[PDB]
From a paper:
To address these problems, we engineered a highly responsive circularly permuted GFP (cpGFP)-based [name] sensor named G-[name] (green fluorescent [name] indicator 1) by inserting cpGFP into the CNBD of the bacterial [name] (mlCNBD), followed by extensive screening. Here, we report the development of the new circularly permuted GFP (cpGFP)-based [name] indicator G-[name], which exhibits a large fluorescence increase (a maximum ΔF/F0 of 1100% in HEK293T cells), decent brightness, appropriate affinity (a Kd of 2.17 μM) and fast response kinetics (an association and dissociation half-time of 0.20 and 0.087 s, respectively). The concentration-response curves showed that Kd values of G-[name] for [name] and cGMP were 2.17 and 30.09 μM, respectively, leading to a 13-fold higher selectivity for [name] over cGMP, which is similar to other widely used [name] probes.
Overall, all residues in G-[name] showed good electron density except for N-terminal nine residues (MGFYQEVRR), C-terminal six residues (GAAASA) and a flexible linker (GGTGGS) within cpGFP. Two G-[name] molecules were arranged as a dimer in one asymmetric unit of G-[name] crystal and were structurally similar with an r.m.s.d. of Cα atoms of 0.149 Å. Consistent with this, gel filtration analysis showed that G-[name] at a high concentration of 0.7 mM was a monomer. Although random coil and short α-helical turns are observed in single-FP sensors with crystal structures available, the first linker along with its flanking sequences in [name]-bound G-[name] folds as a long β-strand.
Author numbering: 10 to 159, 162 to 163, 165, 175 to 237, 241 to 383
Write the structure that this text describes.
Amino acid sequence: GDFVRNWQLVAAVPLFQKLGPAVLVEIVRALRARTVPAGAVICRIGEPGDRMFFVVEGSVSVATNWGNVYITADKQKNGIKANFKIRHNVEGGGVQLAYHYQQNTPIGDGPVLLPDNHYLSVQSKLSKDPNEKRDHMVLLEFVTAAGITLDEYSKGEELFTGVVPILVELDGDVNGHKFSVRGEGEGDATNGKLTLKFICTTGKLPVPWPTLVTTLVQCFARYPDHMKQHDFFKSAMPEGYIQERTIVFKDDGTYKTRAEVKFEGDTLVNRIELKGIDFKEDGNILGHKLEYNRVNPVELGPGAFFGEMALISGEPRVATVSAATTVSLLSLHSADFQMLCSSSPEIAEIFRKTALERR
Ligand SMILES: Nc1ncnc2c1ncn2[C@@H]1O[C@@H]2COP(=O)(O)O[C@H]2[C@H]1O
């Protein structure tokens, strides 16, 4: 019943052809098949991991950790403040730190939610559209609020109950290099999910796309039920908020940004002015020495696997994995994973090395 199905499906996984038929029958009896709708989260970062997954149809996207955004109320200015560090990989190895200093002030006169101290967890995947000739960035992002212990007996939030279209506009000036970016896409606050594509409309971007991610809509963060009273960003909608930043690149220049974030009709719009000063023309930013996505460069399609890191290390999921298309999965529980690795040292090696490479 399920076995004839999983037996048919397991043919799409060439890793298992490293296996005799009697044993393969036993493995297929332990596999569980799953159809996953396009866009759905399969594994969430920080969750415990009791199984791993083999892709039989479709592809999945891995979104890796970008860090935490630490937020505090600014009750006297009726807004919030945030500070955090971004670690950009340098292409030859090493890291370029970007220290972020942030303040947000509502545009409207009405009261907003002024939160207790908390943070936003961000995971991201950066990619390219193989049919796009312009300089561009395709971006997938998950944003989750956390840091308030869950005791256990805003009107702006109802603007984000579904999928909201987003428009992003940036005029930049870095060491006199002027440039513009336009981006469009959609925000799903219910799942904390951003999917956008950005174009440099003036030609070649004079800085690396990863350094513009933070500047290019925290109102799409998923605030958990017990934290809805701490979501300043949605509470200031629809009139919106001003968001300003100082971004200090260690041993290099600084970005200063001012943005208007607000609804125009049904569309959440983010309009940005950015000025960069004191950059080194042969440094990591103006010299384009930062990795775009070498860490995590591809969706994982048929024959690939994920979820193996937690089973090897015992640590929680290190990344969020979501279906890019409709996905057909076979999952394998932890205990049967250890037996698979024991029965086939070849397969054990493939897992070991892949998990190392991904670490
Ligand atoms: N840089 C990466 N490239 C590809 N896949 C990854 C990367 N980082 C994590 N993963 C996968 O994402 C999974 C998330 O859950 P696990 O940590 O159990 O195991 C992880 C790997 O399978």
